[PDB]
Amino acid sequence: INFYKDSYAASASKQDFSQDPSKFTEPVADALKAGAPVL
Amino acid sequence: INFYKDSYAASASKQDFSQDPSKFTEPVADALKAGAPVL
Amino acid sequence: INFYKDSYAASASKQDFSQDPSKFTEPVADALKAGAPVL
Amino acid sequence: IEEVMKTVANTVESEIRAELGVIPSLNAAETGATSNTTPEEAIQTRAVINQHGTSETLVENFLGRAALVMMKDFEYKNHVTGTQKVQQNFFKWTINTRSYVQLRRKFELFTYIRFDSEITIVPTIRLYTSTGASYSGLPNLTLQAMFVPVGAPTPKSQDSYEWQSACNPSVFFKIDDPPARMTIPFMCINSAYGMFYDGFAGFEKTANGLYGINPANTMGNLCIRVVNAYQPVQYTITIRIYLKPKHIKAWVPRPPRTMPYMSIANTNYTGHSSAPNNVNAIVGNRTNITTMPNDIVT
Amino acid sequence: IEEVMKTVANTVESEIRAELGVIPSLNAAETGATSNTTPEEAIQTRAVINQHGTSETLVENFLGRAALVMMKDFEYKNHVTGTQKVQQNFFKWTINTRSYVQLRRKFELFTYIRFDSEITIVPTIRLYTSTGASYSGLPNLTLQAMFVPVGAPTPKSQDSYEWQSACNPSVFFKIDDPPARMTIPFMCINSAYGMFYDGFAGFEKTANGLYGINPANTMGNLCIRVVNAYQPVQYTITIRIYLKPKHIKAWVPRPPRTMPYMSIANTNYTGHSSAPNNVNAIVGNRTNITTMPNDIVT
Amino acid sequence: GVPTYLLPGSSQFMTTDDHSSAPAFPDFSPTPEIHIPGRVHNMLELVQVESMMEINNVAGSSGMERLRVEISVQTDMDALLFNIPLDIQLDGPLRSTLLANIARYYTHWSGSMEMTFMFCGSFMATGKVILCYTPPGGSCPTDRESAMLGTHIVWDFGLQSSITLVIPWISGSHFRMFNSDAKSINANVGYVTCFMQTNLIVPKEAATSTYIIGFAAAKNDFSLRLMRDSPDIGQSQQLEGATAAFQ
Amino acid sequence: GVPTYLLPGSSQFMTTDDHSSAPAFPDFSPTPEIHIPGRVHNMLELVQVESMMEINNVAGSSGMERLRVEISVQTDMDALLFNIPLDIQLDGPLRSTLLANIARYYTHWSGSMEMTFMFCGSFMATGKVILCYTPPGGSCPTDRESAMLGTHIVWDFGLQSSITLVIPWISGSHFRMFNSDAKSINANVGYVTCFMQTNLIVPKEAATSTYIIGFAAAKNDFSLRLMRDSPDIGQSQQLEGATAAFQ
Amino acid sequence: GVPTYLLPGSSQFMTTDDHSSAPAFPDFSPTPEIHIPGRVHNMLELVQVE
Amino acid sequence: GTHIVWDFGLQSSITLVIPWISGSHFRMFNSDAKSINANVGYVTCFMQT
Amino acid sequence: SDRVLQLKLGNSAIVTQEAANMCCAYGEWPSYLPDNEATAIDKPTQPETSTDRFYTLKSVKWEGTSTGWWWKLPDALNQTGMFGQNVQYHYLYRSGFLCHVQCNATKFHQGALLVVAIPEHQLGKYNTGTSASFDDVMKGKTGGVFTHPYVLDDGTSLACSLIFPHQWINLRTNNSATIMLPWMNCAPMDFALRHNQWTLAIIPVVPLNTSGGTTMVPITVSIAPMCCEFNGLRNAIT
Numbered sequence A, B, C: 001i002n003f004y005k006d007s008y009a010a011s012a013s014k015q016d017f018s019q020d021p022s023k024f025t026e027p028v029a030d031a032l033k034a035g036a037p038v039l
Numbered sequence D, E: 001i002e003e004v005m006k007t008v009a010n011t012v013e014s015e016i017r018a019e020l021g022v023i024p025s026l027n028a029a030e031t032g033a034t035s036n037t038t039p040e041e042a043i044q045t046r047a048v049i050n051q052h053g054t055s056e057t058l059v060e061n062f063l064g065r066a067a068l069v070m071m072k073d074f075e076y077k078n079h080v081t082g083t084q085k086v087q088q089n090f091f092k093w094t095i096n097t098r099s100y101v102q103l104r105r106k107f108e109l110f111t112y113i114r115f116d117s118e119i120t121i122v123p124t125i126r127l128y129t130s131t132g133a134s135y136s137g138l139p140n141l142t143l144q145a146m147f148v149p150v151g152a153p154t155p156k157s158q159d160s161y162e163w164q165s166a167c168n169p170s171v172f173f174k175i176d177d178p179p180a181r182m183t184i185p186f187m188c189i190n191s192a193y194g195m196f197y198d199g200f201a202g203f204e205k206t207a208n209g210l211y212g213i214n215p216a217n218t219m220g221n222l223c224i225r226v227v228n229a230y231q232p233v234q235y236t237i238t239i240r241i242y243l244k245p246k247h248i249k250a251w252v253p254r255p256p257r258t259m260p261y262m263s264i265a266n267t268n269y270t271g272h273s274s275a276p277n278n279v280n281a282i283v284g285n286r287t288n289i290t291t292m293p294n295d296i297v298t
Numbered sequence F, G: 001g002v003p004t005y006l007l008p009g010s011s012q013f014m015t016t017d018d019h020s021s022a023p024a025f026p027d028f029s030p031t032p033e034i035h036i037p038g039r040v041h042n043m044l045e046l047v048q049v050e051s052m053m054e055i056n057n058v059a060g061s062s063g064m065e066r067l068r069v070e071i072s073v074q075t076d077m078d079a080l081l082f083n084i085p086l087d088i089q090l091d092g093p094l095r096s097t098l099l100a101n102i103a104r105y106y107t108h109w110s111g112s113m114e115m116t117f118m119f120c121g122s123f124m125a126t127g128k129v130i131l132c133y134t135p136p137g138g139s140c141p142t143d144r145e146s147a148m149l150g151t152h153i154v155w156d157f158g159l160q161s162s163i164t165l166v167i168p169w170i171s172g173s174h175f176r177m178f179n180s181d182a183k184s185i186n187a188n189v190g191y192v193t194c195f196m197q198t199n200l201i202v203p204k205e206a207a208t209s210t211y212i213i214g215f216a217a218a219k220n221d222f223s224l225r226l227m228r229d230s231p232d233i234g235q236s237q238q239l240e241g242a243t244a245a246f247q
Numbered sequence H: 001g002v003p004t005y006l007l008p009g010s011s012q013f014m015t016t017d018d019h020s021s022a023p024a025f026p027d028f029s030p031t032p033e034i035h036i037p038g039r040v041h042n043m044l045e046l047v048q049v050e
Numbered sequence I: 001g002t003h004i005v006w007d008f009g010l011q012s013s014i015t016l017v018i019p020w021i022s023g024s025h026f027r028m029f030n031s032d033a034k035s036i037n038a039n040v041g042y043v044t045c046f047m048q049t
Numbered sequence J: 001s002d003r004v005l006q007l008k009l010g011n012s013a014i015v016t017q018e019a020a021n022m023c024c025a026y027g028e029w030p031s032y033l034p035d036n037e038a039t040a041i042d043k044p045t046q047p048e049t050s051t052d053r054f055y056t057l058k059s060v061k062w063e064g065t066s067t068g069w070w071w072k073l074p075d076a077l078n079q080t081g082m083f084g085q086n087v088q089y090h091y092l093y094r095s096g097f098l099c100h101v102q103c104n105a106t107k108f109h110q111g112a113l114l115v116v117a118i119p120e121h122q123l124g125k126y127n128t129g130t131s132a133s134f135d136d137v138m139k140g141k142t143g144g145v146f147t148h149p150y151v152l153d154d155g156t157s158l159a160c161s162l163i164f165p166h167q168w169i170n171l172r173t174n175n176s177a178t179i180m181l182p183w184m185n186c187a188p189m190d191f192a193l194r195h196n197q198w199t200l201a202i203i204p205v206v207p208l209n210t211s212g213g214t215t216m217v218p219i220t221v222s223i224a225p226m227c228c229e230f231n232g233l234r235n236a237i238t
């Protein structure tokens, strides 16, 4: 329920389930495989 | 939401994006071009 | 908005634009013309 | 005929007229007809597309406004003290619409009106000023307004047993709430209410006492009490009733009242001691029929 | 032409220009036209897709804000004591919109404005401090604000009979409620309200007293009273009226006011004793035309 | 539940509000409507009906004497007979008409009016009068040469006993006002004056004095705005029997 | 009934709320709109109109003397003529313009401005001036060799009497502020300085001193945000006749 | 009018409620978003970092 | 009456047309200059600025 | 091409060889009142060649101490010609105006004039509470002079007055200014003797410098009413 003209007045948008743990956990130039020896 | 009979009772009409800066900035009889020498 | 069962509970009916100025201004047996001499 | 008029009439262009046998500006008031001379045949007019609306002056909008119909104050204390054995924290009103001249004169512009009544009850409260008049705020009391039709028993005390109102409709409303509101239907026994009755309300031919009393204008009584028992201090309750008519239908317009009213039961008149609104002089006097009173001094 | 501008203009790329007969940066202020030199022909610009909106600065949004238009206090007691025979628990205000300079200067940016008025009434209450000023809380009083057009009778007392308001619109609102609110329509006799009137309001040629008084700015009176009868203690009622315009249309923009206002009836000016906002010096003084007052000390 | 909040102006009682409200007598059956003559739908139907003007509103004139103007045989040509102040808010000849009694319930007005005059002399009396309307801006014309320069109609007494002088709507603004300032641009309407065009002529045995009745009305282009309380009535005390209704 | 509950902020009056509210005059018919020239839809239409700058805002200069800058024949080349503080919130030459009077009703701004200068000397007077805009970061240039390193335009007096120096939008952030701190990163805009390019040259009989008028305006990319109360006006007491309205 | 009634918990302020509320700056235009590296959508992205 | 305002510039000549404004179709070269059939009018020059 | 201009109205014509341009106020042209907007119902009189023609007022002398001049734009003509007579005999008036301002000098003279037309210039008074009197504002064809032109005698500012329709007369470039004014009013028509729609103001923003040449430099104003019409004929009042 939003009866205000300005869209910023709306309720919270608690719905964005996308994730990308890889910018922080694996931020390397060459992608690391699984079980393969790192370096 | 307007449940009143008189139309003047309604909310504000903050929606008229048309503009005409030319009645004030160039109110001359002969239209001025761009780069051409004025007079 | 009227959620009452009895129709007399409703809002005012300020909408009857019909007029008949002739029962009061010309309540005569013989209709008077325009410009023609009355009697 | 009957025409629908959302706006007023336009003006059309007019031209020089010099015709034999055509006399638009000549009339005959004896026929009882108002003159039909239009502006376009009186003078040489221009065209004017006129968009002035006529909605504000509709009868429904002319009469459909809340106006004061009753106002009465009463004491809220313990009246049992003394020689009075009855609590008496209440009052009774016989419903009439001729007590306050503003609404009355507006209604008497017509002979018959049919309308539903939107009733609004506005209570106010004050604290009586006497001796120990140490202010302590206004209590939030609940009041009961009971409609009592003709023939129903009427309460004689605040603690009477007529206040159960098994059949009489009642409203219980508090001081701090919005005003109480309810609609009374068109409740006449005839097709319309009569603002004027040129007759008598009794079959018996009494010498006096029954002229102008309409038999159908017996709407009954409004009784209002305080539900709470008396407090140790005395308060004054003022009840104002506003009537708004709606769904209005009006017939037979009448000359407006010019003399001040004197009673709620008759059309008796006396006027003022001098003009304006005097029995010999409704309009104020000017020096002579050749005198502008407000004349531009050029 | 007329263009719809949800955002501001983009900037396009520009390149080296060395042309004969083309002088974009040269203008002629005598024609009355503002310079048409664009940034892309003054300097070598990059492209910029610009998404800055223009909605906040619309005239409807510039003027459509509630501002104080009237504020007045009055005493709520029993004034009948003494040599005064009139209750006088009320006040009367002749409606004007030139009393408070904040709203006034914002309106006088245009010659004509057409708008509907959203009126909000904000009551406050205090208890008068004198002798027996033992606090007991603020009563929940009901107030009546009655609009009185030109020519209508005006109340002379709290208990006057003009307060029935059979035709005059009234609002009954309590202290503890939300502020009262109603919309007044665009109620001018002309197509728009005039913020300035270069003329006289009377056909008669009096020496003085009628310059700048607009004949159409006669909106009438606002009368506000306390419905309750007087309490044993005295209270002070303060009424603040907020005006919000809506559905606004504005024509003919004007230079903003720079001198402080002196009256609500004329444009008389005196300024301050020294710059800024002085009749000889609107902007404050710097030492010379070669002096930055706020200069970075590198 | 529905999440809500309360706006300013909640709980107010405004005497011009328009809402449904609870029916106090449920399933009540109102009396069926019968046909009654003279239904009024609009108040502009009424102001279009003519009514007599107190043109002779002077001291000495009592009752019906005020509704009639004496016209008598002149001994001076071009003579001024009477004038009518064209105002509705202030006290004047128009203030007696049904037009002015309905109009005074409103603040603004527009449109053309009409004044009808009726000759009530003997059959053998002849005469010619000129009735002139002067748009505002100056003083009232006191001589016929100055008065005939505006809107006028020359009335010749004959078999048709009524003349109509239409007051055309000549205003700068769309609407005028019922202001207390009669000398205001938004309120002043003008003047109406009557002069002898030729004379009243009567035989030897006929009466040398005769009467005119004057009537005024609105026309079909007339409109009223901004309803107010009329200054034509007011209370000072409770009426007789008003407080007896509580006992 | 409908089960409801009240949210926080119920019963508040917020001066920027936007709701319908009860019509006080029901069935009122407003006067029909006629065409009136000069309709304004947006306030950015107005700031695009040029207005004179009080460049000569010094003691001794009174009234119109402040709106004009004297340019006179130099005896020293490369001479500094004047400078203009590029600020709108503080007291400066821009504070007189319609641009600055509308902009000061808002807190944030963005977009390019323009300053137009007009030569009002005699026909026989010739000259060349350079008008330089310096992006912020350091002190104002006091020598021409340092000043010409930024954005500049060389104005040659001729048959076209006006030159335009565009102040390009060169800001780190998308918007700036009308802060009281002129030395702030979010507020400082830069400097505008004028130097003699060659000289003013006049014949033997012509006047050796001449005037420039300076104008400033916004361009089509200019925008304003976060409307506030302008510091250009204020009350201290009730105005004359303000309390007379209650009697 | 609409016949209504008030439930328990009306007029409460609960710090975890989720409703619209009145815009204080009407027609305000926020600064357009630019790309900034390192956007976090969930806090479980962070606890996965050693 | 009929007039033309002459501003000295690059064009050195102004033209004041005497329009034919006569009651009759023709006029006369009468010895009576004050006659209805002969008098034509006047031409006057004033400093504008 | 745009430096020469000839204006012809009725039996009057004006030429100029050093015009700047023509200023049409708010991009508008005068026109008669349409039936869509009219309110007075009587047939208007529309004298065209007898009213819509240039009226040249008395000249004012431009000195070094001059503060400026203004003319209330109907009021300046109410006593002049057939326009004035129609104004006197009729209650209601409507017109535009075409305002031409003449001021010529040499190539050694210098100075600038702001020719600005102010709609509804309600005149203020300095350092007093009482409003301006009838004489202070109804100056007629003579016009008035500004007391404090820097605030337009109005507590506003001269600097912002360029929002109004205006032209300049820069002596080094042009010697005339022309502004064409439509009907400015809320109402369809007005009583010409008690309300002024326009004020033509002439303000010397850059002061005149003769530099040994001719000293008497006069400024001349010629105004032509445009599309005049009148309603409510009656006797003449002045």
Ligand SMILES: CCCCCCCCCCCCC/C=C\[C@H](O)[C@H](N)CO
Binding pocket: D069, D095, D097, D117, D119, D145, D146, D147, D169, D170, D171, D182, D184, D193, D194, D195, D217, D219, D222, D241, D243, F024
């Ligand atoms: C639930 C009902 C309790 C409250 C009852 C309130 C009754 C008050 C009614 C006052 C006005 C009633 C008017 C009724 C009829 C007509 O107006 C009159 N006959 C006048 O013609």
Ligand SMILES: CCCCCCCCCCCCC/C=C\[C@H](O)[C@H](N)CO
Binding pocket: E069, E095, E097, E117, E119, E145, E146, E147, E169, E170, E171, E182, E184, E193, E194, E195, E217, E219, E222, E241, E243, F014, G024
């Ligand atoms: C039910 C109505 C009772 C309350 C009535 C409140 C009236 C208060 C009105 C104050 C402001 C009215 C403004 C009206 C018109 C324009 O703003 C002015 N003419 C300014 O141009």
